[PDB]
PDB file of all heavy atoms in Angstrom:
ATOM      1  N   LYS A 131     -51.084-100.335  71.047  1.00  0.00           N
ATOM      2  CA  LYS A 131     -50.186-100.981  70.102  1.00  0.00           C
ATOM      3  C   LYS A 131     -48.779-101.147  70.750  1.00  0.00           C
ATOM      4  O   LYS A 131     -48.517-100.457  71.811  1.00  0.00           O
ATOM      5  CB  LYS A 131     -50.061-100.433  68.739  1.00  0.00           C
ATOM      6  CG  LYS A 131     -51.296-100.389  67.796  1.00  0.00           C
ATOM      7  N   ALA A 132     -47.958-101.972  70.261  1.00  0.00           N
ATOM      8  CA  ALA A 132     -46.605-102.050  70.708  1.00  0.00           C
ATOM      9  C   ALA A 132     -45.629-102.685  69.603  1.00  0.00           C
ATOM     10  O   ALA A 132     -45.914-103.773  69.135  1.00  0.00           O
ATOM     11  CB  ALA A 132     -46.499-103.012  71.928  1.00  0.00           C
ATOM     12  N   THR A 133     -44.628-101.934  69.351  1.00  0.00           N
ATOM     13  CA  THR A 133     -43.625-102.258  68.221  1.00  0.00           C
ATOM     14  C   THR A 133     -42.249-102.173  68.815  1.00  0.00           C
ATOM     15  O   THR A 133     -41.783-101.094  69.422  1.00  0.00           O
ATOM     16  CB  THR A 133     -43.777-101.305  66.993  1.00  0.00           C
ATOM     17  OG1 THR A 133     -45.156-101.317  66.642  1.00  0.00           O
ATOM     18  CG2 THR A 133     -42.830-101.989  65.932  1.00  0.00           C
ATOM     19  N   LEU A 134     -41.554-103.175  68.840  1.00  0.00           N
ATOM     20  CA  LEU A 134     -40.073-103.297  69.110  1.00  0.00           C
ATOM     21  C   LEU A 134     -39.376-103.020  67.912  1.00  0.00           C
ATOM     22  O   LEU A 134     -39.562-103.596  66.785  1.00  0.00           O
ATOM     23  CB  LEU A 134     -39.696-104.661  69.678  1.00  0.00           C
ATOM     24  CG  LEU A 134     -40.237-104.863  71.157  1.00  0.00           C
ATOM     25  CD1 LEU A 134     -40.231-106.259  71.463  1.00  0.00           C
ATOM     26  CD2 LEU A 134     -39.587-104.005  72.129  1.00  0.00           C
ATOM     27  N   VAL A 135     -38.386-102.196  67.836  1.00  0.00           N
ATOM     28  CA  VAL A 135     -37.645-101.729  66.635  1.00  0.00           C
ATOM     29  C   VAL A 135     -36.177-102.053  66.747  1.00  0.00           C
ATOM     30  O   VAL A 135     -35.419-101.511  67.610  1.00  0.00           O
ATOM     31  CB  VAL A 135     -37.816-100.173  66.461  1.00  0.00           C
ATOM     32  CG1 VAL A 135     -37.124 -99.869  65.135  1.00  0.00           C
ATOM     33  CG2 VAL A 135     -39.244 -99.861  66.175  1.00  0.00           C
ATOM     34  N   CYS A 136     -35.657-102.927  66.008  1.00  0.00           N
ATOM     35  CA  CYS A 136     -34.287-103.359  65.931  1.00  0.00           C
ATOM     36  C   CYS A 136     -33.634-102.839  64.605  1.00  0.00           C
ATOM     37  O   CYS A 136     -33.947-103.367  63.463  1.00  0.00           O
ATOM     38  CB  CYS A 136     -34.132-104.922  65.960  1.00  0.00           C
ATOM     39  SG  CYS A 136     -32.524-105.459  66.107  1.00  0.00           S
ATOM     40  N   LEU A 137     -32.710-101.877  64.823  1.00  0.00           N
ATOM     41  CA  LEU A 137     -32.077-101.193  63.601  1.00  0.00           C
ATOM     42  C   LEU A 137     -30.666-101.743  63.556  1.00  0.00           C
ATOM     43  O   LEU A 137     -29.866-101.684  64.434  1.00  0.00           O
ATOM     44  CB  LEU A 137     -32.056 -99.765  63.839  1.00  0.00           C
ATOM     45  CG  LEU A 137     -33.246 -98.896  63.502  1.00  0.00           C
ATOM     46  CD1 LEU A 137     -34.500 -99.703  62.956  1.00  0.00           C
ATOM     47  CD2 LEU A 137     -33.809 -98.157  64.672  1.00  0.00           C
ATOM     48  N   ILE A 138     -30.364-102.276  62.333  1.00  0.00           N
ATOM     49  CA  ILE A 138     -29.056-102.919  62.027  1.00  0.00           C
ATOM     50  C   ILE A 138     -28.233-102.183  60.857  1.00  0.00           C
ATOM     51  O   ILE A 138     -28.732-101.938  59.845  1.00  0.00           O
ATOM     52  CB  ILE A 138     -29.214-104.378  61.506  1.00  0.00           C
ATOM     53  CG1 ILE A 138     -30.146-105.082  62.546  1.00  0.00           C
ATOM     54  CG2 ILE A 138     -27.918-105.058  61.434  1.00  0.00           C
ATOM     55  CD1 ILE A 138     -30.809-106.394  62.073  1.00  0.00           C
ATOM     56  N   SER A 139     -27.110-101.706  61.234  1.00  0.00           N
ATOM     57  CA  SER A 139     -26.386-100.916  60.218  1.00  0.00           C
ATOM     58  C   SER A 139     -24.805-101.258  60.168  1.00  0.00           C
ATOM     59  O   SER A 139     -24.240-101.762  61.099  1.00  0.00           O
ATOM     60  CB  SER A 139     -26.644 -99.432  60.538  1.00  0.00           C
ATOM     61  OG  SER A 139     -26.208 -99.028  61.757  1.00  0.00           O
ATOM     62  N   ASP A 140     -24.228-100.716  58.981  1.00  0.00           N
ATOM     63  CA  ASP A 140     -22.881-100.732  58.839  1.00  0.00           C
ATOM     64  C   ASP A 140     -22.196-102.085  58.730  1.00  0.00           C
ATOM     65  O   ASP A 140     -21.116-102.265  59.167  1.00  0.00           O
ATOM     66  CB  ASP A 140     -22.250 -99.710  59.919  1.00  0.00           C
ATOM     67  CG  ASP A 140     -22.517 -98.357  59.684  1.00  0.00           C
ATOM     68  OD1 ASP A 140     -22.105 -97.825  58.619  1.00  0.00           O
ATOM     69  OD2 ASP A 140     -22.976 -97.660  60.671  1.00  0.00           O
ATOM     70  N   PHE A 141     -22.871-103.062  58.097  1.00  0.00           N
ATOM     71  CA  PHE A 141     -22.364-104.354  58.101  1.00  0.00           C
ATOM     72  C   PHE A 141     -22.098-104.718  56.538  1.00  0.00           C
ATOM     73  O   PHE A 141     -22.520-104.133  55.646  1.00  0.00           O
ATOM     74  CB  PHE A 141     -23.196-105.438  58.708  1.00  0.00           C
ATOM     75  CG  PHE A 141     -24.606-105.527  58.113  1.00  0.00           C
ATOM     76  CD1 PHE A 141     -24.919-106.398  57.285  1.00  0.00           C
ATOM     77  CD2 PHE A 141     -25.722-104.798  58.761  1.00  0.00           C
ATOM     78  CE1 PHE A 141     -26.157-106.630  56.705  1.00  0.00           C
ATOM     79  CE2 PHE A 141     -26.911-104.809  58.187  1.00  0.00           C
ATOM     80  CZ  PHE A 141     -27.149-105.820  57.142  1.00  0.00           C
ATOM     81  N   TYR A 142     -20.988-105.595  56.476  1.00  0.00           N
ATOM     82  CA  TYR A 142     -20.631-106.156  55.203  1.00  0.00           C
ATOM     83  C   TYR A 142     -19.982-107.421  55.373  1.00  0.00           C
ATOM     84  O   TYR A 142     -19.248-107.647  56.457  1.00  0.00           O
ATOM     85  CB  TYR A 142     -19.469-105.233  54.462  1.00  0.00           C
ATOM     86  CG  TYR A 142     -19.328-105.735  53.137  1.00  0.00           C
ATOM     87  CD1 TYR A 142     -20.159-105.292  52.058  1.00  0.00           C
ATOM     88  CD2 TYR A 142     -18.251-106.615  52.841  1.00  0.00           C
ATOM     89  CE1 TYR A 142     -19.888-105.746  50.774  1.00  0.00           C
ATOM     90  CE2 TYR A 142     -18.072-107.097  51.665  1.00  0.00           C
ATOM     91  CZ  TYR A 142     -18.816-106.625  50.475  1.00  0.00           C
ATOM     92  OH  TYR A 142     -18.600-107.142  49.375  1.00  0.00           O
ATOM     93  N   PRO A 143     -20.274-108.450  54.621  1.00  0.00           N
ATOM     94  CA  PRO A 143     -21.192-108.442  53.510  1.00  0.00           C
ATOM     95  C   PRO A 143     -22.675-108.344  53.734  1.00  0.00           C
ATOM     96  O   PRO A 143     -23.151-108.430  54.962  1.00  0.00           O
ATOM     97  CB  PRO A 143     -20.938-109.705  52.626  1.00  0.00           C
ATOM     98  CG  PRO A 143     -20.224-110.586  53.705  1.00  0.00           C
ATOM     99  CD  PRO A 143     -19.602-109.772  54.694  1.00  0.00           C
ATOM    100  N   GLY A 144     -23.595-108.206  52.805  1.00  0.00           N
ATOM    101  CA  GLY A 144     -24.912-107.758  53.106  1.00  0.00           C
ATOM    102  C   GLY A 144     -25.880-108.945  53.390  1.00  0.00           C
ATOM    103  O   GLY A 144     -27.029-108.994  52.939  1.00  0.00           O
ATOM    104  N   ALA A 145     -25.539-109.772  54.401  1.00  0.00           N
ATOM    105  CA  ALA A 145     -26.404-110.949  54.793  1.00  0.00           C
ATOM    106  C   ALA A 145     -26.350-111.135  56.307  1.00  0.00           C
ATOM    107  O   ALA A 145     -25.434-111.247  56.960  1.00  0.00           O
ATOM    108  CB  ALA A 145     -25.839-112.217  54.169  1.00  0.00           C
ATOM    109  N   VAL A 146     -27.553-110.998  56.882  1.00  0.00           N
ATOM    110  CA  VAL A 146     -27.692-111.170  58.269  1.00  0.00           C
ATOM    111  C   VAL A 146     -28.975-111.921  58.591  1.00  0.00           C
ATOM    112  O   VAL A 146     -29.857-112.002  57.752  1.00  0.00           O
ATOM    113  CB  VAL A 146     -27.782-109.862  59.065  1.00  0.00           C
ATOM    114  CG1 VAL A 146     -26.447-109.093  59.268  1.00  0.00           C
ATOM    115  CG2 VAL A 146     -28.865-108.937  58.437  1.00  0.00           C
ATOM    116  N   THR A 147     -29.056-112.599  59.760  1.00  0.00           N
ATOM    117  CA  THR A 147     -30.382-113.262  60.199  1.00  0.00           C
ATOM    118  C   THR A 147     -30.718-112.616  61.529  1.00  0.00           C
ATOM    119  O   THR A 147     -29.794-112.330  62.434  1.00  0.00           O
ATOM    120  CB  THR A 147     -30.099-114.722  60.390  1.00  0.00           C
ATOM    121  OG1 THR A 147     -29.980-115.303  59.001  1.00  0.00           O
ATOM    122  CG2 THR A 147     -31.244-115.338  61.201  1.00  0.00           C
ATOM    123  N   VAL A 148     -32.018-112.441  61.792  1.00  0.00           N
ATOM    124  CA  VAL A 148     -32.352-111.784  62.900  1.00  0.00           C
ATOM    125  C   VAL A 148     -33.454-112.672  63.601  1.00  0.00           C
ATOM    126  O   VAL A 148     -34.286-113.207  62.999  1.00  0.00           O
ATOM    127  CB  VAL A 148     -33.233-110.385  62.673  1.00  0.00           C
ATOM    128  CG1 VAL A 148     -33.620-109.803  63.895  1.00  0.00           C
ATOM    129  CG2 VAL A 148     -32.304-109.618  61.695  1.00  0.00           C
ATOM    130  N   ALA A 149     -33.092-113.025  64.885  1.00  0.00           N
ATOM    131  CA  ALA A 149     -34.148-113.800  65.679  1.00  0.00           C
ATOM    132  C   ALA A 149     -34.607-112.991  66.951  1.00  0.00           C
ATOM    133  O   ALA A 149     -33.758-112.028  67.454  1.00  0.00           O
ATOM    134  CB  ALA A 149     -33.540-115.140  66.169  1.00  0.00           C
ATOM    135  N   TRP A 150     -35.789-113.175  67.329  1.00  0.00           N
ATOM    136  CA  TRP A 150     -36.378-112.375  68.459  1.00  0.00           C
ATOM    137  C   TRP A 150     -36.582-113.513  69.621  1.00  0.00           C
ATOM    138  O   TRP A 150     -37.064-114.551  69.303  1.00  0.00           O
ATOM    139  CB  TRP A 150     -37.604-111.725  68.113  1.00  0.00           C
ATOM    140  CG  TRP A 150     -37.418-110.455  67.251  1.00  0.00           C
ATOM    141  CD1 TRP A 150     -37.517-110.478  65.859  1.00  0.00           C
ATOM    142  CD2 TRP A 150     -37.434-109.137  67.691  1.00  0.00           C
ATOM    143  NE1 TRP A 150     -37.348-109.241  65.463  1.00  0.00           N
ATOM    144  CE2 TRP A 150     -37.203-108.330  66.603  1.00  0.00           C
ATOM    145  CE3 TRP A 150     -37.449-108.579  68.959  1.00  0.00           C
ATOM    146  CZ2 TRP A 150     -37.166-107.000  66.606  1.00  0.00           C
ATOM    147  CZ3 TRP A 150     -37.234-107.141  69.001  1.00  0.00           C
ATOM    148  CH2 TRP A 150     -37.137-106.465  67.843  1.00  0.00           C
TER     149      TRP A 150
END
Side-chain angles (χ1 to χ4, degrees), chain A residues 132-150:
Chain A
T133 309
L134 294 165
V135 181
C136 188
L137 277 1
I138 312 162
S139 58
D140 284 305
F141 58 96
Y142 187 88
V146 287
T147 286
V148 186
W150 289 86

